[PDB]
Design a protein around this nucleic acid. Structure first.
Ligand SMILES: [Mg+2]
Ligand SMILES: [Zn+2]
Ligand SMILES: [Zn+2]
Lengths: 1183, 319, 48
DNA sequence: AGCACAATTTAACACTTTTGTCAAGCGGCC
DNA sequence: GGCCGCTTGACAAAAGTGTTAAATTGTGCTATACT
């Protein structure tokens, strides 16, 4: 059949003897004096004891066997375990045991009535009195009370852990009651918490079998694995494995007990010799509480027992999910060079012989070359250096067949992609430059995992979506990526920075005077006005829109037009002033795509420069192109983008950054103000502290002035000469990076926290005073330990993001939801009570192609409801926002949809990539992680706030807020500067300490009460005194502030689709027929219990609030969860009860082996597409 | 902090014995199996059935009494005598315990933890206290003090991080160990393997002496320190892919063969399934006898080899 | 320090050697073995 | 630190026999 | 008459049963010292 759902939970002790049957016992000897393998005990091959001469009877047929001595046609030689499972039995029959029972009071305390001491009896050190015969001391009992001697005071009676098995049926018959008389404990508060947990644990045993077999009475390990043979190589030898020795402390103990018990063995001797047996159980399960090192009493390495290794932390769960081991790929260095811009790649011309060897062998079989496939495996091994004909047949195989190039580490969706292998020379694997901006890494010897897809159904599934010429142009986040990265920008920026070299201001009677005279000396081709224009009258480039401006590029080639934009009149489409330099740009993009008609109305002219706008040109072009042509651009801007800079050259000489000749005296006035604040001390004025910050602000301002003077000196005169600005404006330079070199930047702060006294005498050209560098280093330390510390905690937080949003996939078609969200067009500023334009940078990416909740009327045409408001509509609303017609643009966010198992159709406006609506199959659940999967490295963990709200952890100072909206009420005293809020009702007492105690008045819903300036009280209180109204929005607004501080491109619903997961769980109150009054049912699934039953029972609920890590421990499935930091409690709660895993889930399929429910394997794309015309015609009658 | 303390508090909570209550209660054992032996040969219970089964009843703290009540005219005292002597398996064996523990603190290292050593140790009392010669006027005391360590040495050799080390290996290992440490303390450098032969005697050269330190004593690797060591070569993927391939190649290389030759090789060189039948069994079913069916075997070595020197295929041997 | 830590066992080993036996083999060369203060002192340079 | 006795058990190796393979002889066919 | 093929006889090489020699356990038990 076909794999589908999955089942688990506990298994009765009788079921344990089912899978294992028998074959066990005997010591755990891993060898003998001779015959290292067999041992007839530990890992003995089932029915293999030297020469059993049997067992082969169970097998029907297939082959012969029974060879008397040595071995027959058994598994030992072949099929031995075959990596398959092989349970033993470990026999066992002692008093009792324990399956760890986790550390969340499971299988005990909850189903019983004892804590912090439930182990005292489970470890054979107490007495769980489970009998009634009327005591004496203080009446009888029914639980633990006989702590030694007590149980003998009367001399049933159970002092061992064996009682755990006795409370099986005793709790089973009372189970029905444990669900009735237990729930009988109505409110009363306090204890109404235990009754909830006790009912959840007993709710499992309430149905679907599952008995309290927690009291293990016979374990069953594994033998096939652990057994590593001799491993020489290099300089070493010997070998072995675990799981065996650490297991020897279980069977042997069970046997020795069978030898002691059988003979004369008094109580005391058995009680301790038994507790060690269960200890061995937990020992084989998980080593904790005390541990069990090797070579006792000496301490060394902790024995590996599932914990952290296998079924636990990174060891056999983190490595098997994704970080497996590809059996078809390789690694190499990185290189760059004009290949063809996308559509191609590098990849060696030697190793490729192995990656594409398979099909390559079959090709030669028919191409005369190799006589057979086998022979083709012995012509390329001894490095005979073929380099003959084979390199040709290899091309046929590498024709239209793409390859997947990966980058480590990985970040966002832009971390893989695919190209077409174009074997070059050597071994270095090169790629296109632009692609680097997606991996974030400088070429310095880095590698790239080169994966290769085999199946042809994987090739088309790749080159059609993973091709760099598709899923790279317009990435997620918000802004484009394929845009011309660094370098390229400077290749077109070096020709549009004006040529005004200052010539003066003469005048001619229509070019008959200062035309020839000035051509001799003074006044060249800069200013000077005549008739109307200026010096533009000199080289009139005629031509036309026939074959580009001839006279233009023609004169430039010769010793005429200096190019580099020297101001010249062309003819193009009209008498302009654009220089032949810009003409080139428009000519490059012209022939590239098709006719300048598009680039003409797109490319600007008023403010050319080619600054940080190259991302808008290509972006705006997509609307009139669409990959096919778009790709051509990034290719045209390539060739010229580098050649122009090559056949020109621009070096960074030590003088290239001319020192501000008008700076020296500036420091004089700044230093002349030093004594000013210094002599104030000798006169006893202004506290030493006031003096401190007084001088700080001084240099904090002058620095900006000096930077301004420099940036200015580098603006007017010295245009193209200064490269430090050519990249600072828009290419590959930082503005604050300039004030460092020619500047003087020295406002460094002490290592702890206190800006030093005197700054730093930067001016690199002049070596520091040997003290300046040591002083500036104190601050240049946090700028490296923080970025590197982005793998300590922050790096282990992104996982939490990918776990939460997982089963979120865009499917179905038109769900139909009323309630909608109204995105704010204007935000407030804590500083001053006044809304701002939100800087536009937030509104744009916040409404980029959405779903207008309702008709939008705003001067002119209306924006129909459900209309995909592209970038155009956005600008139309922003520019019309200043007018005063719109304040809250209506829209539909993923936060409004009755579907927790699936995303939503057409609701997630635009698939932010192909410039169109999302496609059914786009796992936004993973894309949402790709959005946040980038800023991580660009943060400051050394304080952390983004995760604070996620886990809903109460922020610093709690930031107390008004839970209710009363009135003013502002009373002050001595130390009780607390503020209250009430109105004709009850008054709460907010012990407001001493800090942000503002006035304010007229009550307040929540706001902040004044003290909570930022990071309002944990969402717990919000939703508690508000609901899923502010919770779902407060995050999308606050959380982004941490991103807006660094100007992030991502935004939109990428972060608005992950919130619905943390707010899709509800509680229970007076349920209908459904058990558990407490409960913790999910959203949609709960709506079902109130949808079908609505045609009858009231099933009210309350919008609960869970963190980000909590949305994993308790989910609709189990395969997920764990990981984080609790791969122990998960499998517990997950077990016991039925808790049947769902089906629709990326992981569920990847792990189990099923196909992806998303991608091309979605339930919306599994039909037929084969019909060569006549096929449909034939079947038409064949039916 | 180990669980040994819990037992250390239960073992050191009950007092040992005075001095005279050691023999007065011991004699109960002697007359015990004796009074029990009365019914033994009386019905034929080997005197071991009346003891093992009765002792199980002596510990009511957790049947045969039937016929033990019909006591004839000559039986009525033996009853009380059997139960009176039943108290022999009562108090005794509750003291030695404490007197024990303070001994396992010696073998704290060799093998098995302190807690484990307790087992094999105290267990040595179960059989020691039993075989006590109440005759001699020495009084039981520091005797079982030995029946424990001897059980420990007989245990540390039985149980260890090895495989199977009898009384002929542990005693030799420690002997080669003390010697290696004996010559070391009387040389200045670590003695080789052969240089230790003279230290022993006859039979001990350098090979066998190396075979002793070859097996183990406690090594066998630290199991899996720091998925420790990879290494693997059993269910080789390519070997399996080439397994069927090399097989298919033969299925194809046999297409130029005749039944009265191919099948002959099939049954002869055990291929059909696994039966390595010989020309004798291949001649009975193939009409003709030996020779010519053997002249076809050679004909196969040649007629087939003649199809190899011209057709590359000698690359299937290295597999 | 490591040397000391290693020499610590030697002292502990001598004690055990003084608790058992008397005339058989008890000489300042037999009670001291070049294994504890050695192997434990060598594993420091090879692994630490 | 451990030796023996006994007892008993485990392990392996060697024999005489049998089986298989090769060469020679006889018969049949051309 | 000759050549080829088939069958039988002889020789050589490798197994089932027998035979004996080497190792473990128990127990015995030893044994010695201390209380
Ligand atoms: Mg690097
Ligand atoms: Zn067999
Ligand atoms: Zn929807």
């Amino acid at each position: 059949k076909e794999v589908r759902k999955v089942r688990i939970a506990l298994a009765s002790p009788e079921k344990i003897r089912s899978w294992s049957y028998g074959e066990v016992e005997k010591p755990e000897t891993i060898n003998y004096r001779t015959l290292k393998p067999e041992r007839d005990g530990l890992f003995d091959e089932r029915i293999f004891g030297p020469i059993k001469d049997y067992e082969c009877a169970c097998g029907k047929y297939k082959r012969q066997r029974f060879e008397g001595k040595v071995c027959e046609r058994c598994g030992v030689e072949v099929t031995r375990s075959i990596v398959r499972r092989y349970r033993m039995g470990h026999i066992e029959l002692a008093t009792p045991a324990a399956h760890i029972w986790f550390v969340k009071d499971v299988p005990s305390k909850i189903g019983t009535l004892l804590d912090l001491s439930a182990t005292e009896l489970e470890q054979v050190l107490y007495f769980n009195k489970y009998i009634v015969l009327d005591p004496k001391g203080a009446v009888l009992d029914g639980v633990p009370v006989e702590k030694r001697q007590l149980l003998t005071d009367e001399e049933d009676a159970r002092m061992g852990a064996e009682a755990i098995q006795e409370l099986l049926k005793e709790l089973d018959l009372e189970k029905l009651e444990r669900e009735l008389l237990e729930e009988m404990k109505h409110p009363s508060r306090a204890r109404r918490a235990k009754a909830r947990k006790r009912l959840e644990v007993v709710r499992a045993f309430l149905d679907s079998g599952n008995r309290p077999e927690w009291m293990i009475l016979e374990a069953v390990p594994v033998l096939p694995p652990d057994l590593r043979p001799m491993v020489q190589v290099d300089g070493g030898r010997f070998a072995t494995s675990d799981l065996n020795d650490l297991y020897r402390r279980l069977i042997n103990r069970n046997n020795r007990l069978k030898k002691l018990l059988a003979q004369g063995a008094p109580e005391i001797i058995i009680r301790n010799e038994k507790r060690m047996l269960q200890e061995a159980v937990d020992a084989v399960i998980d080593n904790g509480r005390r541990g069990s090192p090797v070579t006792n009493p000496g301490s060394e390495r902790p024995l590996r027992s599932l914990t952290d290794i296998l079924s636990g932390k990174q060891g056999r769960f983190r490595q098997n999910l994704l970080g497996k081991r590809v059996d078809y790929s390789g690694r190499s260095v990185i290189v760059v060079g004009p290949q063809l811009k996308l559509h191609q790649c590098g990849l060696p011309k030697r190793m490729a012989l192995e990656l594409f060897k398979p099909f390559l062998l079959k090709k030669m079989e028919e191409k005369a070359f190799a006589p057979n496939v086998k022979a083709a495996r012995r012509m390329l091994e001894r490095q005979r250096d073929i380099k003959d004909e084979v390199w040709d047949a290899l091309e046929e195989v590498i024709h239209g067949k793409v390859v997947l190039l990966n980058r480590a580490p990985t970040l966002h969706r832009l971390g893989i992609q695919a190209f077409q292998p174009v074997l070059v020379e050597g071994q270095s694997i090169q790629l296109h430059p632009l692609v680097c901006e997606a991996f974030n890494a400088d070429f310095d010897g880095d590698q790239m995992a080169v994966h290769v897809p085999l199946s042809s159904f994987a090739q088309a599934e790749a080159r059609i979506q993973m091709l760099s010429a598709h899923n790279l142009l317009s990435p997620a986040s918000g802004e484009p990526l394929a845009k011309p990265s660094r370098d390229i920008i400077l290749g077109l920026y070096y020709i549009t920075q004006v040529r005004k070299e200052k010539k003066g201001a003469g005048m001619a009677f229509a070019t008959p005077e200062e035309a020839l005279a000035a051509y001799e000396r003074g006044e060249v081709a800069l200013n000077a006005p005549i008739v109307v224009a200026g010096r533009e009258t000199s080289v009139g480039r005629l031509k036309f829109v026939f074959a580009n401006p001839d006279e233009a590029l023609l004169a430039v080639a010769h010793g005429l037009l200096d190019l580099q934009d020297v101001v010249t009149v062309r003819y193009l489409g009209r008498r302009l002033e654009t220089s032949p330099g810009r003409i080139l740009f428009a000519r490059i993009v012209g022939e590239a795509v098709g006719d300048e008609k598009v680039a003409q109305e797109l490319i600007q002219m008023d403010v050319p420069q080619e600054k940080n706008s190259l991302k808008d040109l290509v972006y705006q072009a997509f609307l009139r192109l669409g990959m096919e042509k778009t790709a051509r651009l990034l290719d045209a801007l390539k060739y010229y983008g580098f050649t122009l800079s090559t056949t020109s050259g621009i070096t960074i000489g030590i003088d290239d950054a001319v020192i501000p000749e008008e700076k020296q005296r500036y420091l004089e006035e700044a230093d002349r103000k030093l004594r000013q604040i210094e002599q104030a001390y000798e006169m006893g004025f202004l506290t030493d502290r006031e003096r401190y910050d007084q001088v700080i602000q001084l240099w904090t301002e002058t620095t900006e002035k000096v930077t301004q003077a420099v940036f200015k000196n580098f603006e007017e005169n010295y245009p193209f000469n200064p490269l430090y600005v050519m990249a600072q404006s828009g290419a590959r330079g930082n503005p604050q990076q300039i004030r460092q070199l020619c500047g003087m930047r020295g406002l460094m702060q002490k290592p702890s926290g206190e800006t030093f006294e005197v700054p730093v005498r930067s001016s690199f050209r002049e070596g520091l005073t040997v003290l300046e560098y040591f002083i500036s280093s104190h601050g240049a330390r946090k700028g490296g330990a923080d970025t590197a510390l982005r793998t300590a905690d922050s790096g282990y937080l992104t996982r939490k993001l990918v776990d939460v949003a997982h089963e979120i996939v865009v499917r179905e078609a038109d769900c139909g939801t009323t309630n909608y969200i109204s995105v704010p067009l204007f935000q407030m500023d804590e500083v001053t009570r006044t809304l701002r334009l939100r800087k536009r940078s937030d509104i744009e990416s916040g409404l980029y192609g959405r779903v207008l909740a309702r008709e939008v009327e705003a001067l002119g045409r209306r924006l129909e409801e459900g209309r995909y408001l592209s970038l155009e509509d956005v600008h139309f609303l922003i520019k019309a926002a200043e007018a005063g017609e719109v304040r809250e643009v209506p829209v539909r966010s993923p936060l409004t949809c009755q579907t927790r198992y699936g995303v939503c159709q057409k609701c997630y406006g635009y698939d932010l990539s192909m410039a169109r609506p999302v496609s059914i199959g786009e796992a936004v659940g993973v894309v949402a992680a790709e959005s946040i999967g980038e800023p991580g490295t660009q943060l400051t963990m050394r304080t952390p706030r983004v995760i604070e709200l996620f886990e809903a952890r109460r922020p610093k100072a709690k930031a107390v807020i008004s839970e209710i909206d009363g009135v003013v009420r502002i009373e002050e005293g001595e130390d009780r500067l607390s503020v209250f809020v009430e109105s004709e009702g009850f008054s709460k007492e907010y012990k407001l300490p001493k800090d942000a105690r503002l006035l304010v008045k007229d009550g307040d819903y929540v706001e902040a009460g004044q003290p909570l300036t930022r990071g309002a009280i944990d969402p717990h209180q919000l939703l508690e005194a508000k609901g899923p109204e502010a919770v779902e929005r407060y995050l999308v607004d606050e959380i982004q502030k941490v991103y807006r501080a660094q100007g992030v491109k991502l935004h939109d619903k990428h972060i608005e689709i992950v919130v619905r997961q943390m707010l899709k769980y509800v509680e229970v109150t007076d349920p209908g027929d459904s058990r558990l009054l407490e409960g913790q049912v999910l959203e949609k699934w709960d709506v079902e219990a109130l949808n079908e039953r609505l045609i009858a029972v009231p099933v009210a609920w309350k919008p609960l609030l869970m963190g980000v890590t909590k949305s994993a421990l308790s989910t609709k499935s189990w395969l997920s969860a764990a990981s984080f930091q609790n791969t122990t409690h998960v499998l517990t709660e997950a077990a016991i009860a039925g808790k049947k895993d769902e089906l629709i889930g990326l992981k569920e399929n990847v792990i189990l082996g099923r196909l992806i429910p998303a991608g091309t394997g979605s339930d919306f794309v599994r039909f037929t597409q084969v019909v060569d015309q006549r096929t449909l015609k034939a079947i038409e009658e064949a039916r | 902090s180990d669980p040994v303390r819990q037992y250390l508090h239960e073992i050191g909570q009950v007092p040992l014995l005075t001095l005279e209550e050691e023999i007065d209660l011991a004699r109960k054992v002697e007359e015990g199996m004796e009074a029990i032996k009365k019914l033994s040969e009386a019905t034929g219970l080997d005197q071991e059935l009346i003891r093992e089964v009765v002792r199980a009843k002596i510990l009511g703290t957790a049947e045969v009494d039937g016929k033990l009540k019909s006591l004839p005219k000559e039986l009525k005292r033996y009853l009380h005598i059997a139960r009176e002597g039943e108290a022999a398996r009562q108090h005794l064996i509750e003291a030695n315990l404490r007197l024990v523990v303070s001994i396992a603190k010696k073998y704290t290292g060799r093998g098995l933890s302190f807690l484990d050593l307790i087992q094999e140790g105290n267990q040595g009392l179960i059989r020691a206290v039993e075989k006590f010669e109440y005759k001699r006027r020495f009084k039981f005391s520091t005797y079982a003090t030995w029946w424990i360590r001897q059980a420990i040495n007989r245990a540390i050799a039985d149980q260890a991080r090895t495989i199977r080390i009898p009384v002929h290996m542990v005693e030799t290992i420690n002997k080669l160990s003390r010697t290696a440490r004996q010559l070391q303390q009387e040389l200045g450098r670590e003695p080789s393997y052969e240089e230790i032969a003279e230290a022993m005697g006859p039979g001990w050269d350098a090979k066998r002496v190396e075979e002793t330190l070859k097996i183990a004593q406690e090594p066998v690797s630290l199991e899996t320190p720091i998925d420790f060591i990879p290494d693997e070569n059993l269910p080789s993927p390519v070997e399996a892919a080439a397994q069927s391939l090399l097989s298919e190649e033969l299925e194809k290389a046999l297409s130029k063969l005749s039944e009265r030759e191919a099948m002959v090789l099939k049954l002869r060189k055990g291929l059909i399934d696994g039966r390595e039948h010989t020309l004798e069994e291949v001649g009975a079913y193939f009409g003709v006898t030996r020779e010519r069916i053997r002249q076809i075997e050679n004909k196969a070595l040649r007629k087939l080899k003649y199809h190899e020197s011209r057709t590359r295929k000698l690359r299937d041997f290295l597999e | 320090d490591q040397f000391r830590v290693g020499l610590a066992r030697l002292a502990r080993g001598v004690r055990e050697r003084m608790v058992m036996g008397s005339p058989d083999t008890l000489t300042p060369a037999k009670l001291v073995n070049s294994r504890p203060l050695e192997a434990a002192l060598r594993e420091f340079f090879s692994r630490s």
